[PDB]
Amino acid sequence: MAIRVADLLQHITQMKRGQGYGFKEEYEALPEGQTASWDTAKEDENRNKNRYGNIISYDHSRVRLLVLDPHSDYINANYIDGYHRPRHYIATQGPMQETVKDFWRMIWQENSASIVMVTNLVEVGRVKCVRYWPDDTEVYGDIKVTLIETEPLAEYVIRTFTVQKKGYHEIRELRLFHFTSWPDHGVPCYATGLLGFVRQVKFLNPPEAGPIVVHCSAGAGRTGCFIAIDTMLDMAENEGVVDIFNCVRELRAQRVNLVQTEEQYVFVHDAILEACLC
């Protein structure tokens, strides 16, 4: 069911014409809600580690933390396969006050070099994510994080840090790619800025490092869009085809409801098309 890149404009058009099979039906065919077990996530002892009760971590794909407390192994995060590479990303919720330390522990544990943040901290008066990075230097658990560079651009900001587990000698470099123009449950007016942002991550992420951590507020909608676009550009570049429906289907098998609205699903298509034209 793959679509030739050469045929993508025609496909998207046909899919936007209300007259035959289109995006509403296609989106409605994606599996909605829970499709696999999440027994650990729904443990009483882990309720306060989950931001949204409906978007919690499937057992098969969940990122397990070293146990410190038998329930210390839980974070609301899942490995997500990329095009080339299994466990290429971790999709997770935006940290909560309670989970900031767990978040940095996962980063250390997993050898992650990149964080992709596709939310603002507050949106229309609602907290979406707690600030989990320092203005200067801060210790989260025993993870010491120091800001070394800020690069502001029009629709996003890249912040670079050193990261060190206290009492050990390794000092790592990490980048936080923070996209600032994408509203929760919404989509950007244009794909262009987001595509530049994607291009930066692909350019700068060290491929020898651990998974790229991707998060929004719940870790489904905008997180899923970023992952879908990123993956499909790899597929397009390599095969001259994209299969966005099975991509998002596969995304949902690994973590519930990634790409959370029809408008987002359509936006993923528009963004991939633009990248392919360019």
PDB file of C-alpha atoms in Angstrom:
ATOM      1  CA  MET A   1       0.000   0.000   0.000  1.00  0.00           C
ATOM      2  CA  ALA A   2       3.048   2.272  -0.335  1.00  0.00           C
ATOM      3  CA  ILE A   3       2.779   5.448  -2.378  1.00  0.00           C
ATOM      4  CA  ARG A   4       5.453   6.508  -4.849  1.00  0.00           C
ATOM      5  CA  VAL A   5       6.960   9.887  -3.901  1.00  0.00           C
ATOM      6  CA  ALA A   6       6.292  10.916  -7.517  1.00  0.00           C
ATOM      7  CA  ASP A   7       2.556  10.235  -6.852  1.00  0.00           C
ATOM      8  CA  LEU A   8       2.329  11.826  -3.404  1.00  0.00           C
ATOM      9  CA  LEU A   9       0.795  15.171  -4.454  1.00  0.00           C
ATOM     10  CA  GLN A  10      -1.911  13.350  -6.425  1.00  0.00           C
ATOM     11  CA  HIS A  11      -2.510  10.980  -3.506  1.00  0.00           C
ATOM     12  CA  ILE A  12      -2.893  13.820  -0.958  1.00  0.00           C
ATOM     13  CA  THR A  13      -5.254  15.685  -3.323  1.00  0.00           C
ATOM     14  CA  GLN A  14      -7.446  12.658  -3.936  1.00  0.00           C
ATOM     15  CA  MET A  15      -7.446  12.102  -0.175  1.00  0.00           C
ATOM     16  CA  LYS A  16      -8.618  15.727   0.439  1.00  0.00           C
ATOM     17  CA  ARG A  17     -11.444  15.569  -2.145  1.00  0.00           C
ATOM     18  CA  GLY A  18     -14.545  14.529  -0.228  1.00  0.00           C
ATOM     19  CA  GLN A  19     -15.852  12.314  -3.022  1.00  0.00           C
ATOM     20  CA  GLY A  20     -14.099   8.947  -2.587  1.00  0.00           C
ATOM     21  CA  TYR A  21     -11.845   7.392   0.067  1.00  0.00           C
ATOM     22  CA  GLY A  22     -10.133  10.212   1.983  1.00  0.00           C
ATOM     23  CA  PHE A  23      -8.413  11.171   5.225  1.00  0.00           C
ATOM     24  CA  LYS A  24     -11.417  10.962   7.562  1.00  0.00           C
ATOM     25  CA  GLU A  25     -11.977   7.294   6.718  1.00  0.00           C
ATOM     26  CA  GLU A  26      -8.300   6.508   6.681  1.00  0.00           C
ATOM     27  CA  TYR A  27      -7.735   8.135  10.077  1.00  0.00           C
ATOM     28  CA  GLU A  28     -10.801   6.289  11.416  1.00  0.00           C
ATOM     29  CA  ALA A  29      -9.148   3.018  10.355  1.00  0.00           C
ATOM     30  CA  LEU A  30      -6.127   3.539  12.651  1.00  0.00           C
ATOM     31  CA  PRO A  31      -6.405   1.516  15.881  1.00  0.00           C
ATOM     32  CA  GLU A  32      -7.762   3.835  18.600  1.00  0.00           C
ATOM     33  CA  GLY A  33      -6.997   3.491  22.303  1.00  0.00           C
ATOM     34  CA  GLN A  34      -5.562   0.490  24.103  1.00  0.00           C
ATOM     35  CA  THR A  35      -4.435  -2.317  21.782  1.00  0.00           C
ATOM     36  CA  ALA A  36      -1.979  -4.024  24.195  1.00  0.00           C
ATOM     37  CA  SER A  37      -1.397  -4.561  27.920  1.00  0.00           C
ATOM     38  CA  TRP A  38      -0.115  -1.853  30.226  1.00  0.00           C
ATOM     39  CA  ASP A  39      -0.250  -3.679  33.570  1.00  0.00           C
ATOM     40  CA  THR A  40       2.809  -1.968  35.081  1.00  0.00           C
ATOM     41  CA  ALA A  41       1.708   1.550  34.010  1.00  0.00           C
ATOM     42  CA  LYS A  42      -1.688   1.041  35.688  1.00  0.00           C
ATOM     43  CA  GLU A  43      -0.140  -0.080  39.006  1.00  0.00           C
ATOM     44  CA  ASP A  44      -1.479   2.087  41.857  1.00  0.00           C
ATOM     45  CA  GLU A  45       2.120   2.959  42.758  1.00  0.00           C
ATOM     46  CA  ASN A  46       2.658   4.434  39.255  1.00  0.00           C
ATOM     47  CA  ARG A  47      -0.570   6.469  38.931  1.00  0.00           C
ATOM     48  CA  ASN A  48       1.214   9.701  39.948  1.00  0.00           C
ATOM     49  CA  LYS A  49       3.927   9.153  37.357  1.00  0.00           C
ATOM     50  CA  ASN A  50       1.416   9.381  34.491  1.00  0.00           C
ATOM     51  CA  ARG A  51       0.286  12.770  33.233  1.00  0.00           C
ATOM     52  CA  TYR A  52      -2.730  11.578  31.191  1.00  0.00           C
ATOM     53  CA  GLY A  53      -4.452   8.344  32.371  1.00  0.00           C
ATOM     54  CA  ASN A  54      -5.320   7.339  28.792  1.00  0.00           C
ATOM     55  CA  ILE A  55      -1.849   7.729  27.310  1.00  0.00           C
ATOM     56  CA  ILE A  56       0.211   5.368  29.396  1.00  0.00           C
ATOM     57  CA  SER A  57       2.966   2.917  28.600  1.00  0.00           C
ATOM     58  CA  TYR A  58       2.384  -0.516  26.960  1.00  0.00           C
ATOM     59  CA  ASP A  59       4.360  -3.276  28.715  1.00  0.00           C
ATOM     60  CA  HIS A  60       5.923  -4.744  25.579  1.00  0.00           C
ATOM     61  CA  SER A  61       7.623  -1.506  24.559  1.00  0.00           C
ATOM     62  CA  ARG A  62       8.046   0.406  27.828  1.00  0.00           C
ATOM     63  CA  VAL A  63      11.415   1.875  28.860  1.00  0.00           C
ATOM     64  CA  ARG A  64      12.368   0.071  32.079  1.00  0.00           C
ATOM     65  CA  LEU A  65      14.514   1.961  34.634  1.00  0.00           C
ATOM     66  CA  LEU A  66      17.076   0.239  36.884  1.00  0.00           C
ATOM     67  CA  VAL A  67      15.304  -0.487  40.167  1.00  0.00           C
ATOM     68  CA  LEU A  68      16.589   1.638  43.056  1.00  0.00           C
ATOM     69  CA  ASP A  69      11.389   0.459  45.661  1.00  0.00           C
ATOM     70  CA  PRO A  70      10.055  -2.241  43.283  1.00  0.00           C
ATOM     71  CA  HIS A  71       8.050   0.398  41.438  1.00  0.00           C
ATOM     72  CA  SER A  72      11.142   2.561  40.712  1.00  0.00           C
ATOM     73  CA  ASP A  73      11.434   0.869  37.320  1.00  0.00           C
ATOM     74  CA  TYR A  74       8.544   2.886  35.797  1.00  0.00           C
ATOM     75  CA  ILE A  75       8.502   5.922  33.521  1.00  0.00           C
ATOM     76  CA  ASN A  76       5.720   6.803  31.104  1.00  0.00           C
ATOM     77  CA  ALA A  77       7.869   6.193  28.025  1.00  0.00           C
ATOM     78  CA  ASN A  78       8.121   3.671  25.189  1.00  0.00           C
ATOM     79  CA  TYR A  79      10.797   2.710  22.704  1.00  0.00           C
ATOM     80  CA  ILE A  80       9.777   3.487  19.131  1.00  0.00           C
ATOM     81  CA  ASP A  81      11.464   1.866  16.143  1.00  0.00           C
ATOM     82  CA  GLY A  82      12.767   4.195  13.475  1.00  0.00           C
ATOM     83  CA  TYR A  83      13.058   3.487   9.805  1.00  0.00           C
ATOM     84  CA  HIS A  84      16.628   2.193   9.866  1.00  0.00           C
ATOM     85  CA  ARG A  85      16.910   1.214  13.478  1.00  0.00           C
ATOM     86  CA  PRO A  86      14.982  -0.409  16.325  1.00  0.00           C
ATOM     87  CA  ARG A  87      14.528   1.580  19.506  1.00  0.00           C
ATOM     88  CA  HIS A  88      15.558   4.706  17.566  1.00  0.00           C
ATOM     89  CA  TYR A  89      13.354   7.010  19.686  1.00  0.00           C
ATOM     90  CA  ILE A  90      11.805   7.055  23.117  1.00  0.00           C
ATOM     91  CA  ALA A  91       8.335   8.631  23.053  1.00  0.00           C
ATOM     92  CA  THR A  92       7.429   9.982  26.476  1.00  0.00           C
ATOM     93  CA  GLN A  93       5.231  12.476  28.297  1.00  0.00           C
ATOM     94  CA  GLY A  94       6.518  15.950  29.205  1.00  0.00           C
ATOM     95  CA  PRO A  95       8.065  15.595  32.683  1.00  0.00           C
ATOM     96  CA  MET A  96       5.939  16.139  35.751  1.00  0.00           C
ATOM     97  CA  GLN A  97       7.244  17.740  38.988  1.00  0.00           C
ATOM     98  CA  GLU A  98       7.460  14.225  40.426  1.00  0.00           C
ATOM     99  CA  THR A  99       9.140  12.634  37.399  1.00  0.00           C
ATOM    100  CA  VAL A 100      11.882  15.114  36.466  1.00  0.00           C
ATOM    101  CA  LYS A 101      14.475  13.020  38.307  1.00  0.00           C
ATOM    102  CA  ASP A 102      13.184   9.819  36.593  1.00  0.00           C
ATOM    103  CA  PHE A 103      13.374  11.560  33.254  1.00  0.00           C
ATOM    104  CA  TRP A 104      17.050  12.442  33.705  1.00  0.00           C
ATOM    105  CA  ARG A 105      17.817   8.977  35.041  1.00  0.00           C
ATOM    106  CA  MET A 106      16.349   7.505  31.809  1.00  0.00           C
ATOM    107  CA  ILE A 107      18.407   9.932  29.706  1.00  0.00           C
ATOM    108  CA  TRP A 108      21.581   8.833  31.586  1.00  0.00           C
ATOM    109  CA  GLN A 109      20.656   5.142  31.502  1.00  0.00           C
ATOM    110  CA  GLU A 110      19.841   5.166  27.817  1.00  0.00           C
ATOM    111  CA  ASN A 111      22.828   7.244  26.613  1.00  0.00           C
ATOM    112  CA  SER A 112      20.528   9.711  24.906  1.00  0.00           C
ATOM    113  CA  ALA A 113      22.229  12.721  23.274  1.00  0.00           C
ATOM    114  CA  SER A 114      19.068  14.469  21.942  1.00  0.00           C
ATOM    115  CA  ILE A 115      15.779  15.563  23.446  1.00  0.00           C
ATOM    116  CA  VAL A 116      13.036  16.740  21.058  1.00  0.00           C
ATOM    117  CA  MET A 117      10.463  18.873  22.845  1.00  0.00           C
ATOM    118  CA  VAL A 118       7.363  19.723  20.764  1.00  0.00           C
ATOM    119  CA  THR A 119       5.373  21.704  23.315  1.00  0.00           C
ATOM    120  CA  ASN A 120       5.607  24.914  25.283  1.00  0.00           C
ATOM    121  CA  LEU A 121       5.599  24.635  29.054  1.00  0.00           C
ATOM    122  CA  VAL A 122       2.346  26.563  29.391  1.00  0.00           C
ATOM    123  CA  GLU A 123      -0.268  26.821  26.610  1.00  0.00           C
ATOM    124  CA  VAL A 124      -3.435  28.925  26.979  1.00  0.00           C
ATOM    125  CA  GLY A 125      -3.073  29.003  30.757  1.00  0.00           C
ATOM    126  CA  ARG A 126      -2.499  25.258  31.303  1.00  0.00           C
ATOM    127  CA  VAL A 127       0.773  23.630  32.319  1.00  0.00           C
ATOM    128  CA  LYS A 128       1.790  21.123  29.674  1.00  0.00           C
ATOM    129  CA  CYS A 129       5.285  20.220  30.967  1.00  0.00           C
ATOM    130  CA  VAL A 130       7.450  21.262  33.925  1.00  0.00           C
ATOM    131  CA  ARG A 131      10.744  23.006  33.186  1.00  0.00           C
ATOM    132  CA  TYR A 132      13.348  20.268  33.563  1.00  0.00           C
ATOM    133  CA  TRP A 133      16.491  21.997  32.296  1.00  0.00           C
ATOM    134  CA  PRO A 134      18.656  24.611  33.998  1.00  0.00           C
ATOM    135  CA  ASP A 135      19.326  28.284  33.298  1.00  0.00           C
ATOM    136  CA  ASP A 136      22.842  27.609  34.464  1.00  0.00           C
ATOM    137  CA  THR A 137      23.452  24.324  36.383  1.00  0.00           C
ATOM    138  CA  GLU A 138      21.116  21.947  38.357  1.00  0.00           C
ATOM    139  CA  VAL A 139      21.158  18.394  39.740  1.00  0.00           C
ATOM    140  CA  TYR A 140      18.221  16.137  38.997  1.00  0.00           C
ATOM    141  CA  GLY A 141      18.580  13.157  41.289  1.00  0.00           C
ATOM    142  CA  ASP A 142      22.338  12.792  40.903  1.00  0.00           C
ATOM    143  CA  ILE A 143      22.446  13.986  37.291  1.00  0.00           C
ATOM    144  CA  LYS A 144      24.268  17.312  36.951  1.00  0.00           C
ATOM    145  CA  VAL A 145      23.167  19.324  33.927  1.00  0.00           C
ATOM    146  CA  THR A 146      24.915  22.557  32.871  1.00  0.00           C
ATOM    147  CA  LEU A 147      23.803  24.854  30.077  1.00  0.00           C
ATOM    148  CA  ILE A 148      26.628  25.627  27.664  1.00  0.00           C
ATOM    149  CA  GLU A 149      24.863  27.175  24.618  1.00  0.00           C
ATOM    150  CA  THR A 150      21.469  28.591  23.559  1.00  0.00           C
ATOM    151  CA  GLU A 151      20.704  29.019  19.827  1.00  0.00           C
ATOM    152  CA  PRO A 152      17.364  30.747  19.230  1.00  0.00           C
ATOM    153  CA  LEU A 153      15.777  30.539  15.831  1.00  0.00           C
ATOM    154  CA  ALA A 154      12.381  31.649  14.560  1.00  0.00           C
ATOM    155  CA  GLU A 155      10.236  28.588  15.447  1.00  0.00           C
ATOM    156  CA  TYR A 156      12.552  26.703  17.760  1.00  0.00           C
ATOM    157  CA  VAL A 157      15.565  26.940  20.103  1.00  0.00           C
ATOM    158  CA  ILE A 158      18.467  24.521  20.548  1.00  0.00           C
ATOM    159  CA  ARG A 159      20.012  24.377  23.960  1.00  0.00           C
ATOM    160  CA  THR A 160      23.178  22.402  24.513  1.00  0.00           C
ATOM    161  CA  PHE A 161      24.213  21.017  27.923  1.00  0.00           C
ATOM    162  CA  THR A 162      26.875  18.945  29.601  1.00  0.00           C
ATOM    163  CA  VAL A 163      25.407  15.994  31.535  1.00  0.00           C
ATOM    164  CA  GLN A 164      27.272  14.014  34.238  1.00  0.00           C
ATOM    165  CA  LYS A 165      26.224  11.462  36.851  1.00  0.00           C
ATOM    166  CA  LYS A 166      27.807  12.724  40.037  1.00  0.00           C
ATOM    167  CA  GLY A 167      30.549  10.547  41.473  1.00  0.00           C
ATOM    168  CA  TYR A 168      31.448   9.159  38.026  1.00  0.00           C
ATOM    169  CA  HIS A 169      33.842  10.581  35.453  1.00  0.00           C
ATOM    170  CA  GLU A 170      31.938  10.586  32.158  1.00  0.00           C
ATOM    171  CA  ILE A 171      30.736  13.965  30.857  1.00  0.00           C
ATOM    172  CA  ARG A 172      28.311  13.862  27.926  1.00  0.00           C
ATOM    173  CA  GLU A 173      26.929  16.527  25.635  1.00  0.00           C
ATOM    174  CA  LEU A 174      23.163  16.655  25.124  1.00  0.00           C
ATOM    175  CA  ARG A 175      20.993  18.893  22.957  1.00  0.00           C
ATOM    176  CA  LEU A 176      17.433  19.914  23.651  1.00  0.00           C
ATOM    177  CA  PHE A 177      15.657  20.734  20.436  1.00  0.00           C
ATOM    178  CA  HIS A 178      12.681  22.811  21.531  1.00  0.00           C
ATOM    179  CA  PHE A 179      10.023  23.573  18.907  1.00  0.00           C
ATOM    180  CA  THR A 180       8.024  26.526  20.098  1.00  0.00           C
ATOM    181  CA  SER A 181       5.317  27.153  17.450  1.00  0.00           C
ATOM    182  CA  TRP A 182       3.176  23.933  17.591  1.00  0.00           C
ATOM    183  CA  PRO A 183      -0.007  24.144  19.677  1.00  0.00           C
ATOM    184  CA  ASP A 184      -1.224  21.015  21.597  1.00  0.00           C
ATOM    185  CA  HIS A 185      -4.067  19.228  19.723  1.00  0.00           C
ATOM    186  CA  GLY A 186      -3.231  21.598  16.841  1.00  0.00           C
ATOM    187  CA  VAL A 187      -0.967  22.024  13.873  1.00  0.00           C
ATOM    188  CA  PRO A 188       1.403  24.700  12.629  1.00  0.00           C
ATOM    189  CA  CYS A 189       0.117  26.968   9.873  1.00  0.00           C
ATOM    190  CA  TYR A 190       3.024  25.765   7.703  1.00  0.00           C
ATOM    191  CA  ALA A 191       5.214  22.666   7.721  1.00  0.00           C
ATOM    192  CA  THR A 192       8.311  24.654   6.707  1.00  0.00           C
ATOM    193  CA  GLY A 193       9.666  25.556  10.197  1.00  0.00           C
ATOM    194  CA  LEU A 194       9.058  22.078  11.583  1.00  0.00           C
ATOM    195  CA  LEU A 195      10.898  20.603   8.590  1.00  0.00           C
ATOM    196  CA  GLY A 196      13.926  22.807   9.330  1.00  0.00           C
ATOM    197  CA  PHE A 197      13.778  21.601  12.900  1.00  0.00           C
ATOM    198  CA  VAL A 198      13.662  17.980  11.779  1.00  0.00           C
ATOM    199  CA  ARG A 199      16.641  18.673   9.513  1.00  0.00           C
ATOM    200  CA  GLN A 200      18.646  20.007  12.527  1.00  0.00           C
ATOM    201  CA  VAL A 201      17.962  16.903  14.601  1.00  0.00           C
ATOM    202  CA  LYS A 202      18.930  14.600  11.752  1.00  0.00           C
ATOM    203  CA  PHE A 203      22.131  16.641  11.182  1.00  0.00           C
ATOM    204  CA  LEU A 204      23.179  17.019  14.801  1.00  0.00           C
ATOM    205  CA  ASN A 205      22.054  13.880  16.603  1.00  0.00           C
ATOM    206  CA  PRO A 206      25.093  11.669  17.076  1.00  0.00           C
ATOM    207  CA  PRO A 207      24.142   8.350  15.515  1.00  0.00           C
ATOM    208  CA  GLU A 208      26.333   6.335  17.942  1.00  0.00           C
ATOM    209  CA  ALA A 209      24.238   7.662  20.893  1.00  0.00           C
ATOM    210  CA  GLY A 210      21.144   6.109  22.447  1.00  0.00           C
ATOM    211  CA  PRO A 211      17.541   6.799  21.538  1.00  0.00           C
ATOM    212  CA  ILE A 212      16.352  10.319  20.683  1.00  0.00           C
ATOM    213  CA  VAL A 213      13.895  11.258  23.438  1.00  0.00           C
ATOM    214  CA  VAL A 214      10.723  12.813  21.960  1.00  0.00           C
ATOM    215  CA  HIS A 215       8.058  14.404  24.099  1.00  0.00           C
ATOM    216  CA  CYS A 216       5.158  16.850  24.050  1.00  0.00           C
ATOM    217  CA  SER A 217       2.626  17.022  26.905  1.00  0.00           C
ATOM    218  CA  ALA A 218       1.033  13.517  26.895  1.00  0.00           C
ATOM    219  CA  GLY A 219       3.618  12.046  24.463  1.00  0.00           C
ATOM    220  CA  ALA A 220       1.137  11.069  21.748  1.00  0.00           C
ATOM    221  CA  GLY A 221      -0.075  13.733  19.297  1.00  0.00           C
ATOM    222  CA  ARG A 222       2.772  16.108  18.484  1.00  0.00           C
ATOM    223  CA  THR A 223       5.339  13.462  19.547  1.00  0.00           C
ATOM    224  CA  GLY A 224       3.787  11.002  17.102  1.00  0.00           C
ATOM    225  CA  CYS A 225       3.721  13.643  14.318  1.00  0.00           C
ATOM    226  CA  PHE A 226       7.420  14.394  14.719  1.00  0.00           C
ATOM    227  CA  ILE A 227       8.289  10.689  14.676  1.00  0.00           C
ATOM    228  CA  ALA A 228       6.067   9.944  11.670  1.00  0.00           C
ATOM    229  CA  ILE A 229       7.561  12.782   9.613  1.00  0.00           C
ATOM    230  CA  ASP A 230      11.123  11.952  10.608  1.00  0.00           C
ATOM    231  CA  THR A 231      10.697   8.274   9.782  1.00  0.00           C
ATOM    232  CA  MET A 232       8.874   8.829   6.490  1.00  0.00           C
ATOM    233  CA  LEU A 233      11.493  11.208   5.220  1.00  0.00           C
ATOM    234  CA  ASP A 234      14.030   8.389   5.810  1.00  0.00           C
ATOM    235  CA  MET A 235      11.789   5.909   3.962  1.00  0.00           C
ATOM    236  CA  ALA A 236      11.217   8.370   1.087  1.00  0.00           C
ATOM    237  CA  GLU A 237      14.955   9.100   0.786  1.00  0.00           C
ATOM    238  CA  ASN A 238      15.767   5.379   0.650  1.00  0.00           C
ATOM    239  CA  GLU A 239      12.873   3.640  -1.153  1.00  0.00           C
ATOM    240  CA  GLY A 240      11.257   6.398  -3.240  1.00  0.00           C
ATOM    241  CA  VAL A 241       7.994   5.414  -1.521  1.00  0.00           C
ATOM    242  CA  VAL A 242       6.194   6.303   1.723  1.00  0.00           C
ATOM    243  CA  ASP A 243       3.510   4.346   3.577  1.00  0.00           C
ATOM    244  CA  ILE A 244       2.270   6.836   6.116  1.00  0.00           C
ATOM    245  CA  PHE A 245      -0.812   4.834   7.134  1.00  0.00           C
ATOM    246  CA  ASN A 246       1.196   1.741   8.148  1.00  0.00           C
ATOM    247  CA  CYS A 247       3.799   3.989   9.711  1.00  0.00           C
ATOM    248  CA  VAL A 248       1.196   5.502  12.066  1.00  0.00           C
ATOM    249  CA  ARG A 249      -0.421   2.111  12.579  1.00  0.00           C
ATOM    250  CA  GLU A 250       3.035   0.765  13.622  1.00  0.00           C
ATOM    251  CA  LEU A 251       3.530   3.865  15.821  1.00  0.00           C
ATOM    252  CA  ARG A 252       0.297   3.122  17.670  1.00  0.00           C
ATOM    253  CA  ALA A 253       1.311  -0.532  18.231  1.00  0.00           C
ATOM    254  CA  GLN A 254       4.302   0.723  20.245  1.00  0.00           C
ATOM    255  CA  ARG A 255       2.562   3.552  22.119  1.00  0.00           C
ATOM    256  CA  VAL A 256      -1.136   4.374  22.309  1.00  0.00           C
ATOM    257  CA  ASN A 257      -2.662   7.101  20.055  1.00  0.00           C
ATOM    258  CA  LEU A 258       0.540   8.532  18.576  1.00  0.00           C
ATOM    259  CA  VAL A 259      -0.782  11.079  16.048  1.00  0.00           C
ATOM    260  CA  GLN A 260      -3.840  11.973  17.999  1.00  0.00           C
ATOM    261  CA  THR A 261      -6.132  13.893  15.568  1.00  0.00           C
ATOM    262  CA  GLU A 262      -7.193  13.768  11.920  1.00  0.00           C
ATOM    263  CA  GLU A 263      -5.834  17.280  11.335  1.00  0.00           C
ATOM    264  CA  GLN A 264      -2.430  16.077  12.648  1.00  0.00           C
ATOM    265  CA  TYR A 265      -2.605  12.991  10.377  1.00  0.00           C
ATOM    266  CA  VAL A 266      -3.236  15.303   7.409  1.00  0.00           C
ATOM    267  CA  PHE A 267      -0.458  17.646   8.579  1.00  0.00           C
ATOM    268  CA  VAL A 268       1.983  14.726   8.623  1.00  0.00           C
ATOM    269  CA  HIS A 269       1.084  14.180   4.920  1.00  0.00           C
ATOM    270  CA  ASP A 270       1.484  17.897   4.006  1.00  0.00           C
ATOM    271  CA  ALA A 271       4.848  18.062   5.789  1.00  0.00           C
ATOM    272  CA  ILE A 272       6.180  14.931   4.042  1.00  0.00           C
ATOM    273  CA  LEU A 273       5.025  16.250   0.639  1.00  0.00           C
ATOM    274  CA  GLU A 274       6.753  19.576   1.126  1.00  0.00           C
ATOM    275  CA  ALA A 275       9.998  17.865   2.139  1.00  0.00           C
ATOM    276  CA  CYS A 276       9.750  15.600  -0.943  1.00  0.00           C
ATOM    277  CA  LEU A 277       9.161  18.535  -3.270  1.00  0.00           C
ATOM    278  CA  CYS A 278      12.244  20.170  -1.703  1.00  0.00           C
TER     279      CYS A 278
END
